[PDB]
Amino acid sequence: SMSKVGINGFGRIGRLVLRRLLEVKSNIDVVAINDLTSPKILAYLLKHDSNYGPFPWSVDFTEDSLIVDGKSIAVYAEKEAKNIPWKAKGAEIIVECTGFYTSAEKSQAHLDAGAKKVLISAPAGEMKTIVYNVNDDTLDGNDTIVSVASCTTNCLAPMAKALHDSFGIEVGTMTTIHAYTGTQSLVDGPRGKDLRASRAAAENIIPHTTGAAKAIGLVIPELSGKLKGHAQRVPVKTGSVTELVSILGKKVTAEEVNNALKQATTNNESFGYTDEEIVSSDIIGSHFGSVFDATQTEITAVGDLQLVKTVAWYDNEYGFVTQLIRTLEKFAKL
Amino acid sequence: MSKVGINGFGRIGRLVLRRLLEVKSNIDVVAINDLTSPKILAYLLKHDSNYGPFPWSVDFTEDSLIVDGKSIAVYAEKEAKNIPWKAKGAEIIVECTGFYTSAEKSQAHLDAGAKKVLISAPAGEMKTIVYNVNDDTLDGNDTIVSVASCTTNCLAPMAKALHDSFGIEVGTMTTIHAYTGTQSLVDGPRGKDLRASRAAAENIIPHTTGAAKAIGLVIPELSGKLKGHAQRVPVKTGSVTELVSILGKKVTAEEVNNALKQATTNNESFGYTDEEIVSSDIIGSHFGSVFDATQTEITAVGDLQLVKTVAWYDNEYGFVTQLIRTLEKFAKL
Amino acid sequence: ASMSKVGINGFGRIGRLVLRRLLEVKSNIDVVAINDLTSPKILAYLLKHDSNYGPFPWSVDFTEDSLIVDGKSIAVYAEKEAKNIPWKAKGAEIIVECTGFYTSAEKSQAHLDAGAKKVLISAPAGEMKTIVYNVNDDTLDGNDTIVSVASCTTNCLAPMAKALHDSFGIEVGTMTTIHAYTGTQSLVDGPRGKDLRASRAAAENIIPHTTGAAKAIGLVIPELSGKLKGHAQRVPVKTGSVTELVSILGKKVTAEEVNNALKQATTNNESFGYTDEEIVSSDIIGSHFGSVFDATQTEITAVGDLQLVKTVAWYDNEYGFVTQLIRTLEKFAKL
Amino acid sequence: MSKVGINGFGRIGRLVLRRLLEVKSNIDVVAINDLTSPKILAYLLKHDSNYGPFPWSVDFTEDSLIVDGKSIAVYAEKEAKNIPWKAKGAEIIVECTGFYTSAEKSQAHLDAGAKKVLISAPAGEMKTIVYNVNDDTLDGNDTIVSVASCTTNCLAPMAKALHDSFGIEVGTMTTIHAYTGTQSLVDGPRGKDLRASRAAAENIIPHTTGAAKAIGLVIPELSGKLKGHAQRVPVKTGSVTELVSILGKKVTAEEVNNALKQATTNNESFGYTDEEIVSSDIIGSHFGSVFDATQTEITAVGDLQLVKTVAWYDNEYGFVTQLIRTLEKFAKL
Numbered sequence A: 001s002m003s004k005v006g007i008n009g010f011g012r013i014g015r016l017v018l019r020r021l022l023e024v025k026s027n028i029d030v031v032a033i034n035d036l037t038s039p040k041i042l043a044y045l046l047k048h049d050s051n052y053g054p055f056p057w058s059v060d061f062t063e064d065s066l067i068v069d070g071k072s073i074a075v076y077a078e079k080e081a082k083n084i085p086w087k088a089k090g091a092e093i094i095v096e097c098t099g100f101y102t103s104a105e106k107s108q109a110h111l112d113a114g115a116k117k118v119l120i121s122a123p124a125g126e127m128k129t130i131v132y133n134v135n136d137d138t139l140d141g142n143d144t145i146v147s148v149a150s151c152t153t154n155c156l157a158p159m160a161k162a163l164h165d166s167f168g169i170e171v172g173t174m175t176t177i178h179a180y181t182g183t184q185s186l187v188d189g190p191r192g193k194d195l196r197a198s199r200a201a202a203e204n205i206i207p208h209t210t211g212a213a214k215a216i217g218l219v220i221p222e223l224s225g226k227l228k229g230h231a232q233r234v235p236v237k238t239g240s241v242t243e244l245v246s247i248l249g250k251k252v253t254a255e256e257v258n259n260a261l262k263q264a265t266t267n268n269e270s271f272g273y274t275d276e277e278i279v280s281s282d283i284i285g286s287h288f289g290s291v292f293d294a295t296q297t298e299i300t301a302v303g304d305l306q307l308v309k310t311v312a313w314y315d316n317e318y319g320f321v322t323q324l325i326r327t328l329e330k331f332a333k334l
Numbered sequence B, D: 001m002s003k004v005g006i007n008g009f010g011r012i013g014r015l016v017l018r019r020l021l022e023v024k025s026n027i028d029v030v031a032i033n034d035l036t037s038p039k040i041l042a043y044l045l046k047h048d049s050n051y052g053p054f055p056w057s058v059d060f061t062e063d064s065l066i067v068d069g070k071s072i073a074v075y076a077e078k079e080a081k082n083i084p085w086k087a088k089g090a091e092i093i094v095e096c097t098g099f100y101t102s103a104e105k106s107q108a109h110l111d112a113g114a115k116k117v118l119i120s121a122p123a124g125e126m127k128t129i130v131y132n133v134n135d136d137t138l139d140g141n142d143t144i145v146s147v148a149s150c151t152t153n154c155l156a157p158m159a160k161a162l163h164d165s166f167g168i169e170v171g172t173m174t175t176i177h178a179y180t181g182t183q184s185l186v187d188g189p190r191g192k193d194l195r196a197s198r199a200a201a202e203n204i205i206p207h208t209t210g211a212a213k214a215i216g217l218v219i220p221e222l223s224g225k226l227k228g229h230a231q232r233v234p235v236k237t238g239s240v241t242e243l244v245s246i247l248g249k250k251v252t253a254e255e256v257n258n259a260l261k262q263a264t265t266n267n268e269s270f271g272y273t274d275e276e277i278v279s280s281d282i283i284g285s286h287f288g289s290v291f292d293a294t295q296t297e298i299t300a301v302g303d304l305q306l307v308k309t310v311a312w313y314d315n316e317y318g319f320v321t322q323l324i325r326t327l328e329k330f331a332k333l
Numbered sequence C: 001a002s003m004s005k006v007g008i009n010g011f012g013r014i015g016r017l018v019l020r021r022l023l024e025v026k027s028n029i030d031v032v033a034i035n036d037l038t039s040p041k042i043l044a045y046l047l048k049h050d051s052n053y054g055p056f057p058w059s060v061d062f063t064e065d066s067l068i069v070d071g072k073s074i075a076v077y078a079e080k081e082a083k084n085i086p087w088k089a090k091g092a093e094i095i096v097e098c099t100g101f102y103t104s105a106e107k108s109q110a111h112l113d114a115g116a117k118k119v120l121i122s123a124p125a126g127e128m129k130t131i132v133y134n135v136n137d138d139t140l141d142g143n144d145t146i147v148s149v150a151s152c153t154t155n156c157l158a159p160m161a162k163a164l165h166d167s168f169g170i171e172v173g174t175m176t177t178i179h180a181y182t183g184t185q186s187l188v189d190g191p192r193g194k195d196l197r198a199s200r201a202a203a204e205n206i207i208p209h210t211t212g213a214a215k216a217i218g219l220v221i222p223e224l225s226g227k228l229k230g231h232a233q234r235v236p237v238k239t240g241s242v243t244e245l246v247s248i249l250g251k252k253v254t255a256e257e258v259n260n261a262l263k264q265a266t267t268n269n270e271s272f273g274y275t276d277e278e279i280v281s282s283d284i285i286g287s288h289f290g291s292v293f294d295a296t297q298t299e300i301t302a303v304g305d306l307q308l309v310k311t312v313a314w315y316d317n318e319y320g321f322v323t324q325l326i327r328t329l330e331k332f333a334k335l
C-alpha cells in the first residue's frame, strides 16, 4: 500500500510532513522535494528546528538530494510547478505546501508535470476540503485535487460538528488567538498588500482575516453561511486557540456541553479533550488536529437568550500536520 | 483638595505621577508608600521598559524623591494604618498595591489621616467609576471609590454606546491582554491559580476577569447581562477587548460604526479609529478605550444576529488617564 | 549497598528537571520525598506541564500529601525551614538542594539536622567542595557530605577552560555569557531585592547581570584561581545560553589548533560535546551535555606578539546543567 | 545642496525622515524610492512598532506622500540606475536598501542624475564616517560615502577614547544586538546564510559583522588590531557592544571611566552613563553610543591586563542620529 510522494515547498509545513511520515513509520515513500534552494540549506533546516528540536533521523545532502535515515530524496528548485520533473522518481501524489498553488486551476500544473493527485496544505477555494474524522468519508477514488483547509479549520470543525450534532448551531462567530506564521513580518515593512501583515509579529497583537468560519460549509455542509470569524496573531512561535460563540438550538448547561464533546473525542485520534488548565506551550507537538478545553466553556443566559462559548487548542504546525498526514494516507489508498 | 499620597509605586503607581505631571495638574503628589528604598523607586521611576525615560528630573535622598525639583516623601509601611499621611498633608490616596481592594481595607488610609481613597482596581460593591460613562454618580459625600480594571474602562464605553443606541440583551467578552505582574516569569507556583503559574512571555494563557461580570456597577441596566474572560499573551502592554452581543435591533456594520463614531466625538475617554492598527500603536494612548471600526462584524441568520465589536486599550497608561480624569473630579467634590 | 534514596528541596525549574532526568536515565536512585512551599496539586500540575520541555513523559497524579509519578508514591512536605523537613519518614539520604536559599555549608547542614546523610547543592555555595563532572569529580570522596555543582555557567565554562589550560595554558581571561532569563529576574519592572538590574522586565530587555562563574573557577580548576573574571547579559530566550571566553594563552595558536584540542577533550566525554554546525540557542534545548563547544565561533586576534583567543560554548542552563547535576549525584551516592 | 532622496524607505529610511523633521533640518526630502505603494509607505510611516505614532501629518496620493503638508514623490524602481532623481532635483541620496553597499553599485544613483550618495551601511574601501570620530576627513570632492554600521558607531567612539588615552594594542568585540530585517521570522531560507535562516525572536543567533574588522577606515591606527562578531537576540531594538582590549598602559577602572567621561563631555554623538540601565532605556537615544561605566572590568594577573569596556546604542534611532549629522555636513561641502 505504498505510493510515492513529492513535497512542493519544504517549509514549516513541508518539513513537518516528512517528520511525521517517518514518525508514524508510514508506508508512503517520499521520493522528491521541490523548493527554491540548495540541498545544503534544506538539510540544515531539516536537521535543526526552532520549534521541535533536532530531527529524530539522520540528515545529509548531496549536490542534488537529501539523504534522510539513509534514503535518498531528490531535490529540485523549480519556481513554476509545471517544470518540476515529478516522473523522474515516480512521485504520484504531491503534498502542495508553498502557499502559491491554492486552487484547482493552479495545482493542475502538478498533474501536467506528471503527478496523479495533489493534496493542498491550505484552503483552496471550492474543491473537496477534508477535515480528517469530520468529513474524510467524502473522499473517493475519482478525487485528484483536494484541500485540507487551514490549521484553524481543523481546530474549528470537530468542535462545531460535535455542537451541531448534539444541539444544533443556529449562528456563530469565532476568534482564534493564533501563533505568528511566515506570512507576517519580522520588522515593520511591506508585506504585499495586507497592512496589518506588515507589522512586527513578535511585538504585537495583530488582527488578521481567516476564512475558517466563512468557508466551514465545505467541511460541514449544514453550517454553510452560519459562521464568521477572524484571528488575533500574537507573539508565540506555535500553538493556537480557537473560541466559538454560538447560539445553539437547545438550552444547555456547561456540564452538558462538556459531556457531549467528551463523547465526540472518545476513540478519536483527530480530536482530543482536556479538563486540565493548560496553556499554549502544552499543545506544542500535539498529535490531535484540535483539543477541546472543558475548562473554558461558558454559558451566558438572560431569559430565552443564551450564548455558548467553546474553546479548543491546536498546534497550528505539528497538530495540523498530523491531520494532513491522516488525510494523505487515506487519499493515497483510494 | 490638591495633595496626593500614592500607595504602591508599581506599574500603575508610577504612571500616576507621570500623568499628573504630563497634564500640568494642580494636584501634587506629596507622599509615596511602597516596600523598598527611594534609591530603587527613583531608579524605576526614571527608567521604564514600556514608556522610556522619565520626562522630568528625578533624584533621591534616604527618605524622599526629588521630582522636577519638588520633594516627595517616601515611606515603606507594610500596613496602611501606619502611614503618616498627615506629615506631608496628603488628602487623597491613590491605592495601587492590589492589597487593599475593598471599602473596609482602604479605611486604614482615612484612619492614618487622609480624607479620601481612589482605588486603582475592582474593589467589591462600592461606587465604581469609568470616567465619561458614570462619573456623574460621584457626590461630595463619597470617601472611598474604585475605577475598576483596565478591561472595565475598555469595555464600558463600548457597551454604553451599543446599549444606548441599540440595546444589549446579552453578551460575552474576550480580552486579548498584555501580561501583567500577577503572572509568572518562569513556570512555578503563583498562589493557588494554576494558569498564573505559567511563563507569561512564552504562552497564551486563559485568565479570569470579572470586568464583564461586574459591569452593573458602571452600567446598571447591564447587570448580569455580560460574561467574559481573558487570554494573556506575550506583549508587555497594550490590549484589545472583543464583545459578542445580541442586540435588540438588527444592524449593519456601517450603522454600528457610526453610532460609535458619534459616541466618541469630543470624548476625552473614548476614541475611534478606522485605521489598521496593532497593539503597539495603542502604547501611550490617552484614552481608556479606542473603538476599532475595522474589526466590526455582524453575523446574521434570519432573525438571529451576533454583533462583534472590538476596542483597544493601553491597559497601563490608557487606564491611568482615566484614573487621573476621575481623580481630578473627585478632588473637586 | 550504596545510597539510593533522594529528597528534592525546591521542586522548581531545576528540581522538577532532576526528577525528569533520573527517570529518563532509569537511575537506580529513588526520589522518595519532595519539599517545597505548595500543595501536591500545584506541584503535580507544574510537573505534568512544562513550558520549556513539554508534557512529562510519565504518569502524574497526586493525593493530599504526595505525588504519584509513574505509579510510585513520593511524599510532599511544605516546610519553609530545612531543619523541619521530615526527611527520616521515607528515608531520604541524599538531598538535592534546589531552592536557592541554602547556598552555604552552614545553611545546608540543616538537612543533616533534619535526618539526611548528604547534600548536593544545585548552585555555587561559597568555598565548599564544588564539582564540575568530568572536570574535577575525581576530587570527590567518602568524607564529602555537603557539596556544590556550581552554576549552569560554571558547568559550561569549566570544561572549555580546562581543555584550553591543559593544552596551551591560560594566563588570564574574561568571560561574558549570553544567558536565558531565569526566575531570579522580574516579569514587569518592579523591586527585586537590592539589585537594580534584576528589577527590569526580563523578556523585554538585554540585562547585565553579575555571575561568579569565572571569579570562583579556582574551586574547580585550581591552577586558574583568580585568573578569570566575567559577567552575564540576560536576554529574552526561555532557556539555552552561550558562554564566550577571551583568553591570553601561554602559546601562539591557530583557530584550527584550538578547535582540534577542544575536539580531543570532547571525545568519549559524556559531559562536553562539540559542534561545527551553524547552530542557534533553541538547538541546545534538551541537550545532554553540560557544555557544547562551537568551533564555528573560535577567533584568534593577533598583533605581533599580543594574541587574544575567544572560545565559545553553548549550554542548556536548565536541562544540560541538570544532566551534570545527575552525573555528580550518581557518583556521590556510591562513594 | 538641500534636496535629498531616500532609496529604501525601511526602518532606517523612515527614521531618516523622522529625525530630519525632528531637528527641523533645512534639508528638503523631495523623493523616495522603494518597492511599493504610497498607501503602504504612508501606513508604515504613520505607525511605528518601536517609536510610536509619527509626530507629523501623513497622507498619500497614487504617486506621492504628503508629510507635514509637503509633497514627496514616490518611485518604485528596483534598479537604482532607473530611479528618476532629476525630476524633483534630488541631489543627495540616502541609500538605505542594503543592495548598493559598494562604490561600483551606488555609482548608479549618480548615473541616475544625483550628485552625492550617503550609504547607511559599511560599503568596503571608501570614505567611511563615524560622526565625532572622523567627520573631519569628509572632503568637498567626496560623492560616495559610508556611515558604516550601527555597531561601528557604537564601537568607534569607545575605541577612539581608549586608544587616545592608553593605546589599544589588540582587541576583540562582541555585540549583543537586537534582531533586524536581515534575519527570519520563522525558520526558512535566507539566501546562503544558515544562521540568518533561523527564527530571530526565539533564538540567540551568532552573526558576523565587520564593525571591528573594518575599524581602520574610521580610526586608521587601529587597522587590523580588532576583530569581533555579534549575538543577535530577541529584542526589537537597542543593542550593546563589549570590547576586550590589551592596552599600552596599566589602568584602574576609575581611570578608564574618567577618560571616557572626558571624551563624552560636550559630545553630541557619544554619551555616558553610570546608571544601571538596560536595553529598553537606550531606545530613542540621540547618541551614536552611550558608554556604560557600570560594566567596566579590569582583569589583571602579574604583568598582564585585560580591559573590558561596554557601550549601549539604539541601533535604529541612535545610529540614525549619526547618519543625519553626517548628512548635514555632507550636504554643505
Ligand SMILES: NC(=O)c1ccc[n+]([C@@H]2O[C@H](COP(=O)([O-])OP(=O)(O)OC[C@H]3O[C@@H](n4cnc5c(N)ncnc54)[C@H](O)[C@@H]3O)[C@@H](O)[C@H]2O)c1
Binding pocket: A008, A009, A010, A011, A012, A013, A014, A034, A035, A036, A078, A079, A080, A097, A098, A099, A100, A121, A122, A149, A150, A151, A152, A181, A182, A183, A316, A317, A320, D186, D188, D189
Ligand atoms: N501555521 C502554519 O504554518 C500553517 C498551518 C496550516 C496551513 N498552512 C499553510 O501551508 C502552506 C505553507 O505554510 P508554511 O508556514 O510552511 O510556509 P513557509 O513560508 O514556512 O514555507 C513555504 C516554503 O515554500 C517555498 N516556496 C515558496 N514559493 C515557492 C515555489 N514557487 N516553489 C517551490 N517552493 C516555494 C519556500 O521557500 C518555503 O520553504 C501555506 O499554504 C500555509 O497557509 C500553514
Ligand SMILES: NC(=O)c1ccc[n+]([C@@H]2O[C@H](COP(=O)([O-])OP(=O)(O)OC[C@H]3O[C@@H](n4cnc5c(N)ncnc54)[C@H](O)[C@@H]3O)[C@@H](O)[C@H]2O)c1
Binding pocket: B007, B008, B009, B010, B011, B012, B013, B033, B034, B035, B036, B077, B078, B079, B096, B097, B098, B099, B120, B121, B122, B148, B149, B150, B151, B180, B181, B182, B315, B316, B319, C188, C189, C190, C191
Ligand atoms: N498593570 C495593569 O495592566 C493594570 C491595569 C489596571 C489596573 N491594575 C491594578 O492596579 C493595581 C496595581 O497593579 P500593577 O500592575 O501596578 O502592580 P505592580 O505589581 O506593578 O505594583 C505593585 C507595587 O506595590 C508594592 N506593594 C505590594 N504590596 C504592598 C504593600 N503592602 N504596601 C506598599 N506597597 C506594596 C510593590 O512593591 C509594587 O511596587 C492592581 O490592583 C491591579 O489590578 C493593573
Ligand SMILES: NC(=O)c1ccc[n+]([C@@H]2O[C@H](COP(=O)([O-])OP(=O)(O)OC[C@H]3O[C@@H](n4cnc5c(N)ncnc54)[C@H](O)[C@@H]3O)[C@@H](O)[C@H]2O)c1
Binding pocket: B186, B187, B188, B189, C009, C010, C011, C012, C013, C014, C015, C035, C036, C037, C079, C080, C081, C098, C099, C100, C101, C122, C123, C150, C151, C152, C153, C182, C183, C184, C317, C318, C321
Ligand atoms: N538556569 C537555571 O534556572 C539554573 C541553572 C543552574 C543552577 N540554578 C540554581 O538552582 C536553584 C534553583 O533554580 P530554579 O531556577 O529551579 O529556581 P525556581 O525559582 O524555579 O525554583 C525554586 C523552587 O524552590 C521553592 N522554594 C523557595 N524557597 C523555598 C524554601 N524555603 N523551602 C522549599 N522550597 C522553596 C519554590 O517554590 C520553587 O519551586 C537556584 O540555586 C539557582 O541558582 C538555576
Ligand SMILES: NC(=O)c1ccc[n+]([C@@H]2O[C@H](COP(=O)([O-])OP(=O)(O)OC[C@H]3O[C@@H](n4cnc5c(N)ncnc54)[C@H](O)[C@@H]3O)[C@@H](O)[C@H]2O)c1
Binding pocket: A187, A188, A189, A190, D007, D008, D009, D010, D011, D012, D013, D033, D034, D035, D077, D078, D079, D095, D096, D097, D098, D099, D101, D120, D121, D148, D149, D150, D151, D180, D181, D182, D315, D316, D319
Ligand atoms: N539596526 C538596523 O536595522 C540597522 C542599523 C544600521 C544600519 N542598517 C543598514 O541600513 C540598511 C537598511 O536597513 P533597514 O533595517 O532599514 O532594512 P529594512 O529591510 O527595514 O528596509 C529596506 C527597505 O528597502 C526596500 N528595498 C529593498 N530592496 C530595494 C530596492 N532594490 N530598491 C528600493 N527599495 C528596496 C524595502 O522594501 C524596505 O522598505 C542596510 O544596509 C542595513 O545594514 C540597519
